[PDB]
Design an enzyme around this catalytic site. Structure first.
Site, PDB file in Angstrom:
ATOM      1  N   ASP A 186       0.844  -1.191   0.000  1.00  0.00           N
ATOM      2  CA  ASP A 186       0.000   0.000   0.000  1.00  0.00           C
ATOM      3  C   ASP A 186       0.884   1.247   0.000  1.00  0.00           C
ATOM      4  OD1 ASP A 186      -2.280   1.645   0.021  1.00  0.00           O
ATOM      5  OD2 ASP A 186      -3.036   0.831   1.919  1.00  0.00           O
ATOM      6  N   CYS A 203      -7.849  -2.148  -5.172  1.00  0.00           N
ATOM      7  CA  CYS A 203      -6.823  -2.245  -4.141  1.00  0.00           C
ATOM      8  C   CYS A 203      -7.555  -1.935  -2.840  1.00  0.00           C
ATOM      9  CB  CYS A 203      -5.658  -1.301  -4.433  1.00  0.00           C
ATOM     10  SG  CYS A 203      -6.200   0.350  -5.050  1.00  0.00           S
ATOM     11  N   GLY A 208      -9.066   1.590  -4.350  1.00  0.00           N
ATOM     12  CA  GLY A 208      -9.408   1.571  -5.767  1.00  0.00           C
ATOM     13  C   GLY A 208      -8.864   2.757  -6.551  1.00  0.00           C
ATOM     14  N   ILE A 209      -7.731   3.350  -6.128  1.00  0.00           N
ATOM     15  CA  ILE A 209      -7.190   4.472  -6.901  1.00  0.00           C
ATOM     16  C   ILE A 209      -5.675   4.393  -7.073  1.00  0.00           C
ATOM     17  CG2 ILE A 209      -9.100   6.083  -6.386  1.00  0.00           C
ATOM     18  CD1 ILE A 209      -7.459   7.447  -4.301  1.00  0.00           C
ATOM     19  N   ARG A 261      -2.836   1.773  -6.349  1.00  0.00           N
ATOM     20  CA  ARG A 261      -2.372   0.612  -7.102  1.00  0.00           C
ATOM     21  C   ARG A 261      -3.288   0.311  -8.287  1.00  0.00           C
ATOM     22  NH1 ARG A 261      -1.520  -2.870  -1.556  1.00  0.00           N
ATOM     23  NH2 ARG A 261      -3.238  -1.426  -1.019  1.00  0.00           N
ATOM     24  N   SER A 262      -4.604   0.424  -8.099  1.00  0.00           N
ATOM     25  CA  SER A 262      -5.511   0.163  -9.210  1.00  0.00           C
ATOM     26  C   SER A 262      -5.246   1.116 -10.366  1.00  0.00           C
ATOM     27  CB  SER A 262      -6.951   0.289  -8.737  1.00  0.00           C
ATOM     28  OG  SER A 262      -7.239  -0.629  -7.699  1.00  0.00           O
ATOM     29  N   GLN A 294      -1.447   7.363  -6.621  1.00  0.00           N
ATOM     30  CA  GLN A 294      -1.481   8.104  -5.370  1.00  0.00           C
ATOM     31  C   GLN A 294      -0.130   8.691  -4.938  1.00  0.00           C
ATOM     32  OE1 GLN A 294      -4.104   8.769  -2.626  1.00  0.00           O
ATOM     33  NE2 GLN A 294      -4.599   9.407  -4.714  1.00  0.00           N
TER      34      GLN A 294
HETATM   35  O1  LIG Z   1      -4.816   0.645  -1.898  1.00  0.00           O
HETATM   36  C1  LIG Z   1      -4.345   1.567  -2.601  1.00  0.00           C
HETATM   37  O2  LIG Z   1      -3.423   1.481  -3.480  1.00  0.00           O
HETATM   38  C2  LIG Z   1      -4.824   2.969  -2.336  1.00  0.00           C
HETATM   39  O3  LIG Z   1      -4.949   3.808  -3.243  1.00  0.00           O
HETATM   40  N1  LIG Z   1      -5.076   3.200  -0.994  1.00  0.00           N
HETATM   41  C3  LIG Z   1      -5.475   4.454  -0.497  1.00  0.00           C
HETATM   42  S1  LIG Z   1      -5.810   5.802  -1.236  1.00  0.00           S
HETATM   43  C4  LIG Z   1      -6.180   6.731   0.014  1.00  0.00           C
HETATM   44  C5  LIG Z   1      -6.012   6.024   1.250  1.00  0.00           C
HETATM   45  C6  LIG Z   1      -5.549   4.578   0.896  1.00  0.00           C
HETATM   46  C7  LIG Z   1      -5.267   3.463   1.949  1.00  0.00           C
HETATM   47  O4  LIG Z   1      -5.114   2.283   1.573  1.00  0.00           O
HETATM   48  O5  LIG Z   1      -5.206   3.752   3.211  1.00  0.00           O
HETATM   49  C8  LIG Z   1      -6.291   6.605   2.602  1.00  0.00           C
HETATM   50  C9  LIG Z   1      -7.076   7.859   2.573  1.00  0.00           C
HETATM   51  N2  LIG Z   1      -6.652   8.766   1.482  1.00  0.00           N
HETATM   52  C10 LIG Z   1      -6.597   8.199   0.131  1.00  0.00           C
HETATM   53 CL   LIG Z   2      -4.487  12.653  -6.083  1.00  0.00          CL
END
Ligand SMILES: O=C(O)C(=O)Nc1sc2c(c1C(=O)O)CCNC2
Ligand SMILES: [Cl-]
Ligand SMILES: [Cl-]
Ligand SMILES: [Cl-]
Ligand SMILES: [Cl-]
Ligand SMILES: [Cl-]
EC number: 3.1.3.48
Length: 298
Positions: A182, A216, A219-220, A222-223, A263
């Protein structure tokens, strides 16, 4: 070398991945997410800052509450679609498989583990043992583990999804990348590409099927990395022309359909590396696929 290769070298030399990535965040689309933010949906969202836009959200075919935190990423030029969704919550596993059913997906791509950094990032939404099938009473679905092929850093499962209302039965392929941290990047481009090409080779991305479901935890991140590399490789493939592919522009296009895709700056950097290395296969050297398999140590 390719033009994205020159760009990559220049961005590395000048140390400007953070600023490049922040420029993408600044230009990214901003559309309303009013359904997501309705008080009745508060417990259907894993993260309060990660919501599907209204215009691209997947609607469940039910009249009580059609909401799921999931977005249709419709890549018009590439002619491939993906559904990106958060890791299901204990109360949305029924909704998740209802979505898979209604959208006619053949594959589910999971890029996270259930527990990461000491937290539960995703519910246990599929059965781990053949003899302990799962029944989702709210959406009237049955899910059975048929088999699983465990490799070093990913696992492929065959699942049977049954609509208990019609007794119709479908085979769902589950592709589970188990070694991508993550907020992190895959261990090598090689092992990322080995996994992506396994998904590709299964047929699950065929336009004859519904869109593949990719998730993931949110959903942003890794996805988004996974989808960006796949779409770039596909655009390159369609034109057989690496230089026609502008990776940042493709990412901006994808972000019209769901916020926050990719991310961190290093995931964007890794996206370049995956596409640049994958290009060797697209452009006619299929021996690199064998090299990835070895380098990935599956
Ligand atoms: O699983 C991912 O790749 C992913 O985008 N995770 C994300 S995006 C995202 C978070 C997380 C997390 O897992 O805590 C926490 C709150 N802000 C945005
Ligand atoms: Cl962003
Ligand atoms: Cl409400
Ligand atoms: Cl897991
Ligand atoms: Cl942990
Ligand atoms: Cl959970």
């Amino acid at each position: 070398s390719m033009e994205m290769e020159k760009e990559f070298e220049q961005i590395d030399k000048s140390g400007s991945w953070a600023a490049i990535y922040q420029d993408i965040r600044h230009e990214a689309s901003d559309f309303p997410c009013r359904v997501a933010k309705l008080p009745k949906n508060k417990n259907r969202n894993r993260y309060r800052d990660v919501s599907p836009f209204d215009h691209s959200r997947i609607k469940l075919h039910q009249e009580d509450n059609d909401y799921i935190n999931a977005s249709l990423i419709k890549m018009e030029e590439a002619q491939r679609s993906y559904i990106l969704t958060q890791g299901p919550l204990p109360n949305t596993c029924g909704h998740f498989w209802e979505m898979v059913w209604e959208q006619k997906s053949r594959g589910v791509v999971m890029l996270n583990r259930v527990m990461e950094k000491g937290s539960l990032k995703c519910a246990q939404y599929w059965p781990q043992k053949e003899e302990k099938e799962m029944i989702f009473e709210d959406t009237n679905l049955k899910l059975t583990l048929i088999s699983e092929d465990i490799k070093s850093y990913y696992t492929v499962r065959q699942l049977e999804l049954e609509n208990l209302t019609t007794q119709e039965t479908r085979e769902i392929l589950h592709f589970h990348y188990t070694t991508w941290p993550d907020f992190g990047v895959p261990e090598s481009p090689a092992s990322f590409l080995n996994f992506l090409f396994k998904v590709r080779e299964s047929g699950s991305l065929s336009p004859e099927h519904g869109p593949v479901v990719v998730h993931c935890s949110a959903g942003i991140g890794r996805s988004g990395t996974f989808c960006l590399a796949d779409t770039c490789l596909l655009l390159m493939d369609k034109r057989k022309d690496p230089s026609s592919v502008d990776i940042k522009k493709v990412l901006l296009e994808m972000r019209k359909f769901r916020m926050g895709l990719i991310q961190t700056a290093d995931q964007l950097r890794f996206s370049y590396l995956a596409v640049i290395e994958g290009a060797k296969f697209i452009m006619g050297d299929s021996s690199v696929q064998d090299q990835w398999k070895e380098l990935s140590h599956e």
